[PDB]
Copies of this chain bind each other. A is one copy, B any other.
Amino acid sequence: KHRRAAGPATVLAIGKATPPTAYSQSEYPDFFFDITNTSHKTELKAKFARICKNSGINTRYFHCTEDILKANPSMCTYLEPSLDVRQDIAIREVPRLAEKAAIEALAEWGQPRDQITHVVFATTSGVNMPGADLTLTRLLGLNPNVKRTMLYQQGCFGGATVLRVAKDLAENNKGARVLTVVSELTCVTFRAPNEEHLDNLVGSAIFGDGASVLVIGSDPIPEVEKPQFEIHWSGETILPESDGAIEGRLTEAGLIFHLLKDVPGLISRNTLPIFNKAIEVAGSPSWNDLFWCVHPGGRAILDEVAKTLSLKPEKLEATRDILYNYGNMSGASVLFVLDQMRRRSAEKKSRTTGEGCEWGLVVGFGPGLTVEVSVLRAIATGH
C-alpha cells in the first residue's frame, strides 16, 4: 500500500522572481551611503566603492526601496534596535516573492496545482509561526494535505539543501510532486556601513533579493512533463578546521554575519574530497567535463574555485551570469544558476541541458563551513 517511486528525482520546472526595483551596482555606493546618512565617511565610501566595482555584479533587486527604508528609519542605522520592523516586512514579503516564482514554475510544469503533494521552503530572512511554507500553501491554493518541510535560517547553501530534501520526498513516494522553494530578502541584514565591522561592507555590496521555485518528481510523464535535470546523489560535509569561520547571529539589530577565518581559501582547499566522492556516481569525469552550478558567493571565491580545479573560463559562465545580473541572493542564487544553465543550453542549441556536458554539480556553501553537493545528470535536448 505504501508505494515508492521508480526513478531518480527530476527537476521538471524552474521559476524565478525578483522585486521589481532594479539597482545598478555602479550607482549603488552613492545611493547606499546617502540613504544610511553616512556619506561624510569618505574613506569608508571609497572602500565600498572598490568592493562594488570588483564584485562582478551589475544589477541587484531590492524590495526595500528608498520609500520602504525611509518609512523604517531604524533599518538605516547601524545597530539600533530594528528587528521588529525587519521581521514585519520579511514575514509578509518572503512568501509573496515565492508565490511569483511558483506561479512561473507551476506554469512551465503545466499540471494542475492539486497534483503538488509536497512543499519544501527555505529562507534566511525572518521567522514566523506559522511558517512561510504554510502561507505559500494558502496563497497558491495548494491541497490542504501537502506535506511541508520548512527550513528557516538556512543560509547561503540553502539552494543545494532543498534539492537534497526534495530528492528523498520525490523518490520514496509514488507520484509525489514537490514544490521546492527558496525565497530571500535582504531586509534582515541591510544596515548602515561602519568602520568597526568592515566585513559588513562586502555583504552590503553583494546581497540582493530573489526567489526560485522548482517542481521535482520521479517517474516523469512522457510528453506531458519535461525533464530538465536528474538528481542522482546528494551529500554534504563539514569542512575540516572550520569552526567559527562564519557565524550568523539574529539579534535585536537584525541578522549580522561574523567571520573569523579564511573562507574563500577554506572552500577551495577542502572541497576536493566531497567533490571526488560526489562525481563517483558519474563515473568520475574530469572537472572540465562536468557542468557547474556553484553558489555565486563572491567573484573571488569563484576565481579561486576555477584556479584550484583548472577550469576553463566557460565553465562558470552560467554562475557568473547570475552574479552579474542579480548578485548574491543567498540560497536562491544557485537555483537561478540552474535555470540559466538550461537556458544557455536552449539558446545555443546544446546537446544537453548542461551545455553539452552529461553530468554536473550543484554546490552551496555557508555556515559551520558546510559544503553541499548534488550530482545532476543533464537531459538530452534533441539538438
Chain A residues near B (Cβ < 8 Å): 1-2, 4, 8, 81, 83-84, 87, 124, 127-131, 134, 137-138, 144-155, 164-165, 167-169, 171-173, 232-240, 243, 246-252, 257, 274, 277, 281, 366-368, 370
Q: Is B173 in contact with A168, judged by CB distance below 8 angstroms?
A: yes
For A274, what are the chain B residues with a Cβ–Cβ distance below 8 Å?
Answer: 145
Closest B residue to A82 using CB positions: B252
CB distance from A144 to the nearest CB of B (A): 4
- Which of B83, B130, B137, B236 is A251 in contact with, Cβ under 8 Å? B83
A153:B131 contact, CB within 8 angstroms: yes
Q: For A251, give the chain B residue with the smallest CB separation.
A: B84
The contact of A366 among B129, B250, B368, B370, by CB within 8 Å, is B129
A130/B171 in contact, CB under 8 A: no
Q: Which of B84, B138, B145, B171 contacts A172 (CB 8 A)?
A: B171
Kindly list chain B residues whose C-beta atoms are within 8 Å of the C-beta of A150. Answer: 151, 153-154
Residue contact A252 to B81, C-beta cutoff 8 Å: yes
User: Counting chain B CB atoms within 10 Å of each CB, which of A131, A168, A257 scores highest?
Assistant: A168
A95 to chain B, nearest CB (A): 12
Complex CA–CA separation, A265 to B320 (angstroms): 54
- Complex Cα spacing A150 to B4, Å: 24
What B residues does A8 contact at CB under 8 A?
Answer: 2
Q: Give 12 A-B contacts (CB < 8 Å), ordered by A residue.
A: A83-B251, A87-B250, A128-B248, A128-B249, A129-B248, A131-B153, A134-B367, A144-B240, A147-B235, A149-B149, A151-B151, A168-B173
Q: How far in angstroms is the closest Cβ of chain B from A366? A: 7
Closest Cβ of chain B to A75, distance in Å, is 14
* B129 and A153 within 8 A (CB): yes
Contact A153 B168 (CB under 8 A): no
Given contacts A171-B4, A238-B134, A252-B81, contact A149 B129 (CB under 8 A): no
Q: With A2-B171, A238-B144 given, is the CB distance from A370 to B130 under 8 Å?
A: yes
Closest B residue by C-beta to A155: B129
Among B171, B233, B236, B277, contact of A148 (Cβ-Cβ < 8 Å): B236
Whether the pair A129, B238 counts as a contact (CB closer than 8 A) is no
A74 CB to closest chain B CB (Å) equals: 11
- Other A-B contacts than A129-B247, A145-B274, 17 sampled, CB-CB below 8 A, are A4-B4, A4-B171, A81-B81, A83-B251, A84-B252, A87-B249, A124-B129, A128-B249, A129-B155, A129-B248, A129-B249, A134-B367, A144-B240, A149-B165, A150-B151, A152-B152, A171-B172
A238 and B4 contact, CB distance less than 8 A: no
Q: Most chain-B Cβ atoms within 10 A of its Cβ — which of A146, A167, A169, A252?
A: A252
